[model samples]
Target: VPPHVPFELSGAELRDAIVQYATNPIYHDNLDWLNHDNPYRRQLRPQVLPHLDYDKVPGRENILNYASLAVQRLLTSVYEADLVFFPKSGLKGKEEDFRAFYSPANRALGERIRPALERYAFGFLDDEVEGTWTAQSLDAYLDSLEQSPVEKAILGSADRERAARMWLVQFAPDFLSEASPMMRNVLGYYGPAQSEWFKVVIDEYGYGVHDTKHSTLFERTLESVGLESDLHRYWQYYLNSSLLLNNYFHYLGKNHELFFRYVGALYYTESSLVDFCRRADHLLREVFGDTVDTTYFTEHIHIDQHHGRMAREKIIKPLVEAHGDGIIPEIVRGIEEYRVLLEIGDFDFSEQIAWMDAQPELKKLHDPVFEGLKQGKVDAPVAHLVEPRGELSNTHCHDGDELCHIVSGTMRFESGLGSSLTLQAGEGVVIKRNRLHGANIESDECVYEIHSVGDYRKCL
Candidate 1:
């Protein structure tokens, strides 16, 4: 298909373009690059097409799933094209996939989709935060973040270990490639500010020692917890807020105009990590017992303390001193943008944990809603889906709460790893808005209908 003119595209046209680019088989079905022993392989195995209607631009309601994943997938591809990634196994068999992944045509598709997606995803920040911050106030703000609400969003569930694993899955995309975005600012000439930024970059790189690199440490942490340590191995499981957090860095880094914003976000990230890492280390140990490898968190607990201070004094202060207070607003925007997203990400994860943990009770709550639908007391379904045996509906979320009614055959719906419910003909379940889930067909042919109930309580 010819690339659509991004500027001329309507909402539905733009959405179609995004889905077309995102669902191309080259990006989705390539298992050749997935062999784990190859340390150099980089591929996005997002699996599952977003279930939203094709004519829909991801409206505010579907922002968390359909929109966020599409944007993050494209954004990461563009940013990563700068880095080298090839199967260590060889290029002969994988050459076509490799070329297509970085092809100019594919890149143009990304360029076309990104601006609109970004506006949809992040333009709200402009209205959400307003501030006039001097270097002094920004510094004070960074210092006070240790007492922020994010510290309270640690593991809080009866299934603490599973929740912690889900937490690690969210971090996989960024932590596995830690500090690459910071390198974007390291280039070009900006005098001492640029030089000081490199100081933090070298630390993230373990000062050129492969064994101690921060990303490498995170791999150990993932391995210890029995999670796949490869970059984005758990891609399908990342929450919308988690994708927002990851995409924010790449968005700022890739757009050089947002350098000040990137610096601000970077400061908040490094500074907040000191205490956040401390709490994370405790949570991991408590859930996984002593065997859990916490070197990654411990490393951050110590290093980010220094990194936080360095970001404040060594980086932000010099930039402000050199440029004057005129630049402080953008700088503060970066800080607040990240801070707000962090809080939202924390809440999203906690809510998922609580919701998933309460699945048994939630399933019971579905009975009345299903009955209402059967007797015509509830709204009719907006759509229906049918699948053959063994078919997988890759995990995704909805804009509003929905009920998945099985019309025929059997299916297994999974909300998280090893967390699922089996449904037969005439059976159904409540699917809360923005809760990640996928389904697998068990019978020869499984049919289902999706009834969108804006507020699930209304059905009850």
Candidate 2:
């Protein structure tokens, strides 16, 4: 009996433990703390080994076998409950029928993998799990989730089948040893079925540049660490904390409709990881001496520097461009989640480096561009419109009203009501419907204005 370890996770206790774990000199000093070659086998062996029930071989095996399945089940449960609670105008009951299409064999497989799935993929929701339901029935559990305000609020807009599919494809294979058929199906949809996705995949595959490819980079990193680079080899040794982190990403990435959130999370993760890689590289060079062996860290420093920008420009910006106004909240949430993960893993390495070296003053960076996210106060009495050295005449508001406040320039506004207002710096004027307004530079002026209502698109 492993002392009947309590199943409950206390945030206070966890935080204290994390603080203590972070202060450990060996944990801080080791570059390959989570990798198999290190004294600690990286952090995985120390952090996770305590949680397993080694006394019962069969129980342990069952736990490992069913982890991914449990994750899918929990994701599906959350998704279905969200739908019922939110009841999207036309999306009701659509997911149930689609999920039903999974054959009995598939369902059985899902059931078998459910334990590990729940453990890793859906572990974040464990706090809510207790309040959810005690019953074994999925329907009863979902109904319970529907009634919980917390669950309803978080999941109401989420799509259930898409959520499940996301879990299967993006999350499970990374955390679990066994891959599901559903995972293959999900991959096929994005890879072969969607042209845009196929092109993206081609680029990710390095566009025939073997050295630049991401998968190869991961493989090289693994070999350098003396760990088998094949996927999921260290599944048995994964830190529960790392598994939970991976699961959070899996849940977010697999659900396509939540693409904005997914991209936001990835953006934050990549941005944060860059600093971590730098610190890790520093430690490796300090301890192990720099060589091709340290290429993993150095490579990411350069690659992710460029790659991170590409992800932001290519993936995140387009998503925002398409649906920013509506999905801003979800994007914020995703960025926040990434921030939380980064903080969780932030112990002695990066922070200590900063503290000891008195590094350059760096702004606290997160994702999703917070400053301009919501509508903010606009300075009133808009003034000063300055266009330096351009066509000085023949300017008119044809489609809408033009309003401006002069901060350092002068402008004459001819209103439709046959009124002319000579605007100077610190003064404002409005060009009414079909009103003519143009600016002439007086000492190279500047003005800020609000276009009350007009089609700037027409000018283009």
Candidate 3:
């Protein structure tokens, strides 16, 4: 018998391993890509680089954001090996990018850090829920989720449409790869359960007809709303909470022992999708108008109703009957775990939207402080003072809140797609932790300083 390898890397070693795996040219920031030919562009790019700082990400919520991105990238790196990816421009000059991305060393790095990273991102779920549960109890819980206030916060926001756009950005990572995790579970011998699961998979795939494929419908939905349909085009904008929900499925699917858990998660999502999708369809039509294709939501509204019933009856019931109650804990655990993750995502997304909407107010409050800092009257720990002429910061997020104070130049701070706050000298804006943002110097030469205020409230 061979010895088992331990995933024991942590601290600097673990952080370095994650960056080493993620540092391939394929993941580099390329602003001038004409288009994609291969279609499946599963690249991380440079947006996640800053958050990989191990020392800065050890806190409770910080690690979740950091590790969620780390493990999701690591897990997808493994899955993409089976799929194909290449820049549409051509692969001749980029052969090395492809080679390094799938290099054995990189793969091994992923294997080493994935266990610790998953524990960081998801270990809380193991303790968040526990109890004996029956099929009836599980169904009742899932039904309660359906009634839960889905997107009510977003729908009620003053900038509801912008928040909705951020919401779609969160969904892009998973919806674009819809059913992929389920595809993992479809393999192996499991009698009727396999066939029943396959049925749901086929429906997601639009029954082998590419035009109607669920992901294809989502692509159109994206394009209709003036968003790019390419995979990970808005990669920098993906929230850690959103990444958690996406990674949770792959985690369960990739681990075969978690099959029953996958079933429970599947049941919860499929059943709940009907209500959620209905609201989503209505929201899109209301905000984006008739031009926006709501087919994806409408499609789910119809299909998931069937899928909900199919999962409970055709899959979960069969498995429980065949294996007895031994698997019930894992199954119910899956539902509760996913439910909690959804709640986290919901709250995080709402908070981010509120922060983005309040940028102007934040800037107004910082005006007087900016004068003091710029005049050198305030002894603040300045992180960096930069002078740039027409340069972009290349969208990324921070592990802690910050204050970006302009010293003697003009800059446009972009907090989200098509949303920016222009600041001249003597102005500034609060940068919330984990909120995607970037800046472009808009003058001949602009000077600015960043203050790493751990909590924005402290700056007040």
- Which regions of candidate 2 fall more than 4 Å away from where they truly are? 1-108, 111-204, 209-212, 290-292, 345-460
Worst 10 residues of 1 by lDDT: 31-40
Against the true structure, whose TM-score is highest? 1
Candidate 2 lDDT: 0.37
Candidate 2 lDDT by residue in tens digits, 300-394: 56655655565555655455456444555565556665555434323211222222122111111101111211223222222333465331332
Worst 10 residues of 3 by lDDT: 32-41
CA-RMSD of model 2: 27.0
| Model 3: CA > 4 A from native | 1-7, 30-82, 85-105, 131-150, 371-380
In the range 50-72, model 1's lDDT, one tens digit per residue, is 43343344543345665455555
Model 3: lDDT equals: 0.73
Expressed as tens digits, the lDDT of each residue in 260-312 for candidate 3 is 88998999889988988898888788787888899999988888989999998
Cα-based TM-score, every candidate? 0.86, 0.38, 0.86
The C-alpha RMSD of each candidate to the native structure, in angstroms, is: 4.5, 27.0, 3.7
Q: lDDT (CA) for every model shown?
A: 0.73, 0.37, 0.73
Supply the TM-score for candidate 2.
0.38
Can you rank all candidates by lDDT, best first? 1, 3, 2
